[PDB]
């Protein structure tokens, strides 16, 4: 009821009308504990536990910290564009622990948590690089039950290559019996990237919801896509047309304008 959730897929305007309405909605929006990942916690409202996570474009690593501390993840692969100074003392398997993950170091010492860090200058750390997957695949666990991709990009930028890294993992390196949830940070100002998800990733799942956390900025087109129920028969067609996908994006932005105009966005 207070939760902003729009089904990604489940008598409609033309793509030209949708694109024009979206441009107007984006113009209107534009004019309108630091370690806690509040946004990801709101996205994961229906879930309470995961065992093996693959967290991509993690930045400081607050999403990985949430999955370990609150969701009880025992094995986690953490990719981030942030490298660390060589003088920091805490390491996990020779790689420098991100500052945000220092509270979980005792779990690694007691053998209760396996963290696989992909934050080194000696590795490829940009998931949009064409050789990232080959560089890291022998270190990525192939039994993940949750995959997250939290990259921040500028508005309007095509994010297809970030989504492509997740598609590569799903099509080459997961156990279809164990993958339960895929979470992507998306930008609704990036229509090419949204349509890429509709063509590539969304047809692999039985459920998909766009969620706008209360802790996500009222002016940003940032939303999260929560995909679940990986299908046991691989579809050879999309769940919906590009026109239906554009209409969903327009509906989500209309609901966001409505929320922001009434004045409600939590941060401090």
């Amino acid at each position, epitope marked *: 009821p207070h939760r902003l959730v729009v089904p990604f897929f489940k008598i409609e305007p033309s793509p030209e009308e949708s694109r024009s309405n979206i441009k107007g909605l984006l113009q209107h929006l534009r004019t309108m504990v630091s370690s806690m990942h509040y946004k990801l916690d709101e996205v994961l409202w229906e879930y309470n536990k995961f065992e093996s996570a693959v967290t991509l474009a993690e930045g400081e690593g607050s999403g990985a910290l949430l999955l370990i501390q609150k969701y009880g993840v025992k094995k986690l692969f953490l990719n981030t564009l942030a490298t660390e100074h060589s003088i920091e003392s805490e390491v996990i398997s020779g790689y420098t622990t991100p500052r945000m993950l220092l509270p979980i170091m005792p779990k690694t010492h007691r053998g209760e948590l396996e963290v696989i860090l992909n934050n080194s200058a000696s590795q490829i750390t940009d998931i949009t690089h*064409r050789d990232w*997957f*080959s560089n890291q*695949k022998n270190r990525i666990p192939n039994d993940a039950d949750i995959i997250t991709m939290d990259a921040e990009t500028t508005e309007n930028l095509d994010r297809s290559r970030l989504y492509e890294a997740v598609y*590569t993992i*799903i*099509c*080459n*390196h*997961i*156990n*279809p019996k164990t993958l339960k949830v895929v979470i992507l940070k998306v930008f609704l100002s990036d229509l090419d990237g949204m349509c890429w998800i509709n*063509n*590539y990733l969304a*047809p*692999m799942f039985g459920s998909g919801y766009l969620i706008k956390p209360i802790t996500s900025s009222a002016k940003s087109s940032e939303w999260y896509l929560c995909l679940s129920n*990986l*299908l*046991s*028969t*691989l*579809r*050879t067609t999309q769940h919906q047309t590009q026109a239906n996908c554009l209409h969903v994006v327009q509906c989500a932005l209309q609901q966001q304008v409505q929320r922001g105009s009434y004045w409600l966005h939590h941060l401090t």
Partner: nanobody, 122 residues
Framework: DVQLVESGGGSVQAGGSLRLSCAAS????????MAWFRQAPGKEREFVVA????????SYADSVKGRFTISVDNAKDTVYLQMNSLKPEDTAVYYC???????????????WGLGTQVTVSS
């Protein structure tokens, strides 16, 4: 680039079986939907079934239901097609194809093997 090599074809008596293999090399992860197609003389290329390298299968063509099975050995970069209860109508050149997306049209796959002949005698 992806390179594909099919093997396991040949002549077989009606009612018999064959097991085709498709050894893939190159950037296999970038075209992770591996499909089997077949083309009978004078006929168009027919989609048989496809699987991701992770093991997710599409549904099978009605003409092969209950007889053919696709499988993968991801560690060996090989895809297999088990072909049982073969009949003369199954005679065709069988091809392995690698694509970015699961699609039934041959033109949606940009990498192909040279094919392996399968001949089922009456």
């Amino acid at each position: 680039d992806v390179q594909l090599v099919e093997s396991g074809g040949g002549s077989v008596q009606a009612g018999g079986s064959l097991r085709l293999s498709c050894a893939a090399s190159g950037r296999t992860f970038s075209r992770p939907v591996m499909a089997w197609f077949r083309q009978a003389p004078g006929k168009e290329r027919e989609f048989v079934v496809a699987i991701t390298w992770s093991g997710i299968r599409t549904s099978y063509a009605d003409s092969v239901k209950g007889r053919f099975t696709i499988s993968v050995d991801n560690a060996k970069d090989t895809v297999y097609l088990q072909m049982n209860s073969l009949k003369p109508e199954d005679t065709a050149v069988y091809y392995c194809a690698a694509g970015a997306l699961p699609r039934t049209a041959h033109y949606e796959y940009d990498y192909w093997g040279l094919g392996t002949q399968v001949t089922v005698s009456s």
